[PDB]
Design a protein around this ligand. Structure first.
Ligand SMILES: N=C(N)N1CCCCC1
Ligand SMILES: [Ca+2]
Length: 223
């Protein structure tokens, strides 16, 4: 996250870190046994880390649980990033409390102008590299579809939205991928792609979760 603030320990209780020997992507806990992340974060050998603040220090609220099954969306296209969503099943259920909690799925899609919270452990610089150890947060609005399409001609599908600031300076960045965009207490986006980080006229692009609720629910019911 570029241009954000330190969230505070366990203030984003649905945020997870995906670990394969190191943090590589975020995700969101949607019930006690399932996480949703970005398809472009897929790899084998995932450990899900819940209850994290500092990802390099054991602070006492962590739960570390291996994945048993990953499911990339059937129509994910790695060239265009259309349908950039995956589900991860945990080998055992997490123990839910005030510091480790699920986030609700939306019943309706959010409109442009709605303020949302984006969070992650990704790079904090738009030039160069500095990775934080503690969770960072950013408040940002959903942008109109017309603004989003004008920023990225030919690249925005109905399964994507833009959020952030056209003036630059505040955005998600590398290592934030897969993490949550929460608006009015519901999961509306997944950190997906963008051009650089925090550049003028190049806002972040997010997977539009409201289009996937039926697939999520059906998949969880059957796996
Ligand atoms: N929001 C931006 N700029 N991103 C998404 C996360 C990876 C880098 C590009
Ligand atoms: Ca920790």
């Amino acid at each position: 996250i570029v241009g954000g603030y330190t969230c505070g320990a366990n203030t984003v209780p649905y945020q997870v870190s995906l670990n394969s020997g190191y943090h590589f992507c975020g995700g969101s806990l949607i019930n006690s046994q399932w996480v949703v992340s970005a398809a472009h974060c897929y790899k084998s050998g995932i450990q899900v880390r819940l209850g994290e603040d500092n990802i390099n220090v054991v602070e006492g609220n962590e739960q570390f649980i291996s994945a048993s099954k990953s499911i990339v969306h059937p129509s994910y296209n790695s060239n265009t990033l259309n349908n950039d969503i995956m589900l991860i099943k945990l080998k055992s259920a997490a123990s839910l409390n005030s510091r480790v909690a699920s986030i609700s799925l939306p019943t309706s899609c959010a409109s442009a102008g709605t303020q949302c919270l984006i969070s992650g452990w990704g790079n904090t610089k738009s030039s160069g590299t500095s990775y934080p150890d503690v969770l960072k947060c950013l408040k940002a609005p959903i942008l109109s579809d017309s603004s989003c399409k004008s920023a990225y001609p030919g690249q925005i599908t109905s399964n994507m939205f833009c959020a952030g600031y056209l003036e630059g300076g505040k955005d998600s960045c590398q290592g934030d991928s897969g993490g949550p965009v929460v608006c009015s207490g519901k999961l509306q986006g997944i950190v997906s792609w963008g051009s650089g980080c925090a550049q003028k006229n190049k806002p972040g692009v997010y997977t539009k979760v409201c289009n996937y609720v039926s697939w999520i629910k059906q998949t969880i019911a059957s796996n």
